[PDB]
Paper text:
Entry of HIV-1 into target cells involves the binding of the trimeric viral envelope glycoprotein (Env), which comprises the surface subunit gp120 and the transmembrane subunit gp41, to the cell receptor CD4 and chemokine coreceptor CCR5 or CXCR4, which triggers a barrage of conformational changes in Env complexes that activate the activity of gp41. Then, three C-terminal heptad repeats (CHR) fold antiparalelly onto the trimeric coiled coil of the N-terminal heptad repeats (NHR) to adopt a thermostable six-helix bundle (6-HB) structure, which drives the viral and cellular membranes merger eventually leading to the occurrence of fusion. Peptides derived from the CHR or NHR regions of gp41 have potent anti-HIV activity by competitive binding to the counterpart (NHR or CHR) thus preventing the formation of viral 6-HB structure. Thus, we determined the crystal structures of HP23L and LP-11 bound to a target-mimic NHR peptide with the wild-type sequence or resistant mutations.
As a lipopeptide, LP-11 exhibited sharply increased binding stability and anti-HIV activity relative to its template HP23L. Thus, we determined its crystal structure in complex with an N-terminally extended NHR peptide, N44. Although the resolution of this structure was relatively low, we could build the most residues of LP-11/N44 in the electron density map except for eight overhung residues at the N-terminus of N44, which were not targeted by LP-11 thus their missing did little for inhibitor binding. As predicted, the C-terminal fatty acid group of LP-11 could not be observed due to the poor electron density map. The crystal structure of LP-11/N44 verified a typical 6-HB conformation, in which trimeric central N44-based coiled coils were bound by three inhibitor peptides in an antiparallel orientation, and they made a plenty of hydrophobic interactions similar to the 6-HB structure of HP23L/N36. However, two structures revealed the major differences in hydrophobic contacts. First, Trp-120 of LP-11 did not have any contacts with Ile-62 but had hydrophobic contacts with Val-59 on N44 trimer in addition to contacting with Trp-60 and Leu-57. Second, Ile-134 of LP-11 failed to contact with Ala-47 while its Leu-135 failed to contact with Ile-48 on N44 trimer, which were found possessing hydrophobic interactions in the HP23L/N36-based 6-HB structure. Surprisingly, there were exactly the same salt-bridges and hydrogen bonds in the two 6-HB structures. Importantly, the superimposing comparison demonstrated that the L-T hook structure in the 6-HB of LP-11/N44 was exactly identical to that of HP23L/N36, including its intra-helical hydrogen bond network and inter-helical hydrophobic interactions.
Author numbering:
A (entry chain F): 2 to 36
B (entry chain D), C (entry chain E): 1 to 36
D (entry chain G), E (entry chain I), F (entry chain H): 47 to 69
Amino acid sequence: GIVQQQNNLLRAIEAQQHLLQLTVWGIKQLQARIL
Amino acid sequence: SGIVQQQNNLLRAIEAQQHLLQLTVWGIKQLQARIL
Amino acid sequence: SGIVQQQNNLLRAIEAQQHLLQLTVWGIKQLQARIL
Amino acid sequence: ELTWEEWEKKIEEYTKKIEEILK
Amino acid sequence: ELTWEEWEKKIEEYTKKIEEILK
Amino acid sequence: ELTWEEWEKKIEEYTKKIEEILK
């Protein structure tokens, strides 16, 4: 039901925001060791 | 609160997350360019 | 049309976005393995 | 694995895929 | 076409934007 | 500071987390 599917969608985007935070972090490391 | 308002909200955070994804593919391409 | 359909679409978006993430993680891994 | 061309290829196809689903 | 400063500013802007929409 | 191992482990964690919310 849509309240449940929507809570799940919110938790997905949260976790995905953490993955993004991590890819940004790695990019920053790399770049600080080439630039 | 109501399911539609919250549905919009989830849409806006998803398009914002696509612009973050875009920005990271850009930085990758940049360091790809430096290196190789 | 309606919230069942806008929700199916939202699910497929997050699915595809998870693939983009897998790809940016992959590129980061390449870069980093050629600096570290 | 992958090439960097094919990576670019795949990034471009998932970006238009999302970009369609988002209109 | 970007600087790394401006990239960082855009990452920070969209992160606060999502982070508002999620609180 | 993170280590690259622990980064990889966090990526793997969140990927299976999303991947199980997507079932």
